[PDB]
Design a protein around this nucleic acid. Structure first.
Ligand SMILES: [Mg+2]
Ligand SMILES: [Mg+2]
Length: 678
DNA sequence: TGAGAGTAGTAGGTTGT
DNA sequence: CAACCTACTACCTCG
């Protein structure tokens, strides 16, 4: 085509074709007593399956097995929703399954994965955790070690053969007491675990007290409490460590050092990247080895044809290579702006170099700049808000806050406090110093995006002149479904919309349509017309007919559309057969899905290609991939590294994250071109 | 709070039928 | 139940 071909390996491997015994599994009818309700029937079968033993999986309103009935537990009980059901399994012969059919293919894949897990459990001496296995020591030191292995998957192809997915992975384990850990000049860890069970404890203050002299409620002492439960049989008790429950907040419980064990994270190791060549090596090694342990034959690595998409041409006022360059060359679109400085460290006026850099920039862009300084501290209560309102009145559009590093709660409180008065903010943290150029340049880009300037845009010719991303965020049992967009054939404007509260991940049909409509209306305000075609991007999978209503409404306005499910995980891995690993690789797969490797640099380790599904619409793939790839480059708030996600989705995820953090109630007075969440 | 991917560690929560 | 989203923490860099 227009774009240049090459060939790649996937981290997938073809094994045997399925013989007929594997194609004619035992079928079983499940009889529950009493009968289950409609929502509970489906998971209870899964429950009956584990209790059934052997190698059995859910099938329809019944069971499928690769084990003969004689070694299953056909009669039993299973307690679930506080009701004890008696199950009886009734065998109904074997029956042929057809591999071309995605439903039965789903069952054969389930049966295969169960087969795999059971075959791994009987391996020795290797360490099994579900579908991940760890084989050798990658590292080790005084009291700790890192195991290495792979995460595995097994399923069945549309042509009825086994398929192996392999991806190297690491495990960190410690198996050392807290006392001994400290007794070798390590510092105190973040997290710790009971030596006698799984309970974690957030560690805190090691303590000066004594046990066999500390008093627990019940007349007993720490020492004799733990002694009583006999835990001081193997171990010896320690100093007196203090722990706070992980759910509980800052309540302190006592605890011997001799009975705690540190839990280690990455933070605690002062590789695991694996430059891609090594990962590819290891993947082939582990794959072939697994093939050998299993009665599945010789593993053959899967190849796919790949194409390199043209490199997008990024623009400020003139040609650019990174968004930080717009600081020197000028923005795509400049407007008359005013910015404020808030010093929370007890310092005085504007840092000089910042003033020089921005002034130079707005000079290049040919727009006028006015700089203000806010004289008030938030500790002044309501007068602080008064000063904020006064500032907004004087024309101020965004705020820079120079402060020592803030605790999250205080950070959120301040940000929000400015937001209710329509002031997006950029925090920058003192010390700073001019020679730390990247940090303060990225903060500066953030500031400009938050006052609504468009620092960069594209130069290509793309199929859709409006692109919109959708995601749900927030962590309090409810979420925020939100949308963000890039407007114009040039992506010349960036906008967000107010999210909506929802029960979970599924965005209601009418909500989808309303957010979409707001972006259409925005396009109407800029271009003076409706878009010929829009590109609709959903983060993660698109749930059944979630877009149906929005889609129909679009068809009704005479607007053409494309729906793309963009999945951040599950897309596996891609390694070139002989060249360099390059950015911007398009890899078509089955009929409507394809991979897209958008971001990569060598000092990061092996990339994680995105997986994309064209759920609806009739624009050709290649062009979809082309536009999405180019859109990954639009993000204005990262000066030196493009995000993996295309600009609308990266914005959407950051939007719902921020609304999920602060609240939605502050946004009533904040303009939609101002990206307060970056 | 500079922010980016890719890592593993913890703790969450949700969709399917 | 089963498989798979979100959110946070280092780190080293700076298309
Ligand atoms: Mg997200
Ligand atoms: Mg930010």
């Amino acid at each position: 085509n227009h774009l240049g071909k090459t060939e790649v390996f996937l981290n997938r491997f073809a094994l045997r074709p399925l013989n007929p015994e594997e194609l004619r599994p035992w079928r079983l009818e499940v009889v529950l007593d009493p009968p289950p309700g409609r929502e509970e029937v489906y998971p209870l079968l899964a429950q009956v399956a584990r209790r059934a033993g052997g190698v059995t999986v859910r099938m329809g309103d019944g069971l499928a097995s690769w084990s003969p009935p004689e070694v299953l537990v056909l009669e039993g009980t299973l307690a679930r929703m506080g009701q004890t059901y008696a199950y009886r399994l009734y065998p109904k012969g074997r029956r042929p399954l057809d591999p071309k059919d995605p439903g039965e293919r789903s069952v054969l894949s389930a049966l295969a994965r169960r087969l795999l897990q059971e075959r791994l459990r009987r391996l020795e001496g290797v360490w099994v955790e579900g579908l991940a296995v760890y084989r050798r020591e990658h590292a080790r030191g005084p009291g700790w070690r890192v195991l290495g292995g792979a995460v595995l998957d097994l399923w069945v192809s549309d042509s009825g053969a086994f398929l192996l997915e392999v991806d190297p992975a690491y495990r960190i384990l410690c198996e050392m007491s807290l006392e001994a850990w400290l007794a070798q000049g390590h510092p105190l860890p973040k997290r710790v675990r009971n030596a006698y069970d799984r309970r974690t404890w957030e560690l805190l203050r090691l303590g000066e007290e004594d046990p066999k002299e500390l008093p627990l409620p019940g007349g007993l002492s720490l020492l004799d409490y733990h002694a009583s439960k006999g835990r001081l049989q193997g171990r010896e008790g320690g100093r007196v460590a203090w722990v706070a429950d992980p759910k509980d907040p800052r309540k302190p419980i006592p605890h011997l050092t001799g009975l705690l064990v540190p839990v280690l994270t990455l933070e605690d190791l002062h590789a695991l990247s694996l430059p891609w060549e090594e990962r590819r090596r290891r993947t082939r090694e582990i794959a072939s080895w697994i093939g050998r342990r299993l009665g599945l034959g010789t593993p053959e690595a899967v190849r796919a044809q790949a194409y390199r998409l043209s490199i997008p041409k990024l623009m400020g006022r003139r040609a650019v290579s990174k968004p930080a360059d717009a600081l020197r060359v000028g923005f795509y679109r400049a407007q008359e702006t005013a910015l404020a400085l808030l010093r929370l460290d007890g310092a005085q006026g504007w840092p000089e170099f910042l003033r020089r850099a921005l002034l130079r920039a707005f000079g290049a862009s040919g727009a006028s700049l006015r700089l203000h300084t806010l004289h008030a501290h938030p500790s002044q209560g309501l007068a602080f808000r008064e000063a904020l309102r006064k500032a907004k009145e004087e024309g101020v559009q965004a705020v820079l806050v120079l402060t020592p590093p803030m605790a999250w709660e205080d950070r959120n409180r301040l940000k929000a406090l400015l937001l209710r008065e329509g002031l997006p903010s950029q925090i920058l943290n003192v010390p700073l110093r001019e020679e730390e150029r990247h940090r303060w340049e990225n903060a500066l880009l953030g500031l400009l995006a938050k006052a609504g300037l468009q620092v960069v845009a594209l130069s290509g010719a793309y199929p859709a002149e409006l692109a919109v991303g959708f995601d749900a965020g927030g962590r309090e049992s409810f979420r925020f479904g939100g949308a963000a967009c890039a407007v114009g054939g040039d992506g010349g404007h960036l906008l967000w919309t107010l999210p909506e509260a929802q029960a979970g991940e599924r965005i209601p049909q009418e909500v989808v349509w309303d957010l979409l409509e707001e972006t259409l209306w925005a396009f109407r305000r800029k271009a003076g017309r409706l878009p010929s075609r829009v590109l609709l991007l959903r983060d993660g999978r698109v749930p059944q007919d979630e877009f149906a209503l929005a889609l129909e409404a679009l068809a009704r306005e005479g607007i053409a559309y494309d729906l793309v499910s963009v999945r951040k995980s599950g897309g596996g891995r891609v390694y070139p057969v002989q060249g360099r690993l390059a950015d911007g690789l398009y890899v078509p797969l089955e009929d409507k899905t394809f991979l897209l490797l958008t971001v990569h640099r060598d000092f990061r380790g092996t990339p994680r290609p995105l997986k994309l599904v064209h759920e609806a619409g009739d624009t050709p793939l290649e062009a979809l991939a082309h536009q999405i790839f180019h859109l990954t480059r639009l993000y204005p708030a990262s000066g030196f590294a493009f995000p993996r996600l295309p600009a609308p989705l990266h914005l959407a995820d950051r939007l719902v994250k921020e609304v999920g953090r602060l609240g939605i109630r502050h946004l009533k007075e904040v303009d939609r071109e101002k990206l307060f969440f970056v």
